[PDB]
Structures are given as structure tokens and as C-alpha cells.
């Protein structure tokens, strides 16, 4: 596996909190700038983040990212997610499930 964050740098969100953009080292050892549209791989399932879902941003507010959050310096995305009953919940997800494959952000 390996988190993308173990071989990437300078990660930020862009496009209104929808896109992860990072500099990822490739197999030649060079830095390659990569983007991954998080709406293609993260959903909002009744107020919780869902890996393998889609389109979370459509029912999220206050999207926030810290690429090196906490003592363990993990890439944490936070948002308020609406549940099916209309209530918003503060939620967090660690983006370390995203990999760097030869200079590209991927999710499997």
C-alpha cells in the first residue's frame, strides 16, 4: 500500500475543496504534480464519509484540509456532512488510502 503522503509533498485541496493536488515522487525519483477529483472516490453515506462512494461535496459544508494534521502528521480532510434526515455532522477522513503510483495519485 503506502500512503501517497509518504512519497509526496505540498498537498493541498483546490477547486472549492473538491480536488486533491500534490507533488508525488515517481519511479525515476522526480517530482510530478498530480490531481485527484475526490468526488470520484468519496461519497457521503447518511452523514459519513464513504471510500468508494461519489459526490460527497454536493452534501457537504465547511470543507477543510490539513496535509500534516496532528502528532502523526496525517492528511485529514474535514467537513460537515448532511445525513438523510437533514442533520449536519462534523466528520473527518484520512486521505492516506490514496496511493502514489509512479507520480500519480490513485485510489484502489
Amino acid at each position: 500500500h503506502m500512503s501517497y503522503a509518504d512519497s509526496s509533498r505540498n498537498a493541498v485541496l483546490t477547486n472549492g475543496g473538491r480536488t486533491l493536488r500534490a507533488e508525488c515522487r515517481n519511479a525515476d525519483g522526480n517530482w510530478v504534480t498530480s490531481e485527484l477529483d475526490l468526488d470520484t472516490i468519496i461519497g457521503n453515506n447518511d452523514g459519513h464519509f464513504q471510500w468508494g462512494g461519489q459526490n460527497f461535496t454536493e452534501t457537504a459544508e465547511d470543507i477543510r484540509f490539513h496535509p500534516k494534521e496532528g502528532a502523526a502528521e496525517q492528511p485529514i480532510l474535514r467537513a460537515r456532512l448532511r445525513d438523510c434526515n437533514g442533520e449536519f455532522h462534523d466528520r473527518d477522513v484520512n486521505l492516506n488510502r490514496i496511493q502514489n503510483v509512479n507520480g500519480r495519485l490513485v485510489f484502489q
Side-chain angles (χ1 to χ4, degrees):
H1 180 77
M2 237 67 56
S3 172
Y4 83 87
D6 294 339
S7 62
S8 301
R9 67 181 186 197
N10 294 328
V12 298
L13 304 187
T14 186
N15 300 318
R18 305 186 290 173
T19 301
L20 179 65
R21 184 172 171 87
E23 295 154 28
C24 300
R25 197 188 298 112
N26 67 17
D28 290 338
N30 292 315
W31 300 92
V32 179
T33 307
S34 185
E35 290 189 350
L36 187 51
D37 178 352
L38 296 178
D39 273 335
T40 64
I41 58 167
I42 299 173
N44 173 4
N45 176 11
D46 191 25
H48 278 285
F49 285 114
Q50 176 190 343
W51 283 108
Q54 301 170 53
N55 305 145
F56 86 95
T57 67
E58 295 178 32
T59 54
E61 290 189 4
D62 308 313
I63 300 165
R64 303 291 181 263
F65 179 60
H66 190 330
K68 290 190 173 188
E69 202 189 77
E73 292 178 283
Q74 293 295 306
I76 305 306
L77 183 156
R78 296 174 178 279
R80 292 170 64 245
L81 299 185
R82 195 172 82 251
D83 73 19
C84 294
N85 283 337
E87 189 173 342
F88 294 74
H89 304 273
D90 294 321
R91 299 292 188 212
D92 61 275
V93 61
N94 187 329
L95 297 188
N96 73 4
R97 290 204 193 197
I98 292 162
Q99 297 179 61
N100 167 15
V101 179
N102 193 30
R104 177 179 177 239
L105 295 168
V106 299
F107 174 69
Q108 320 144 346

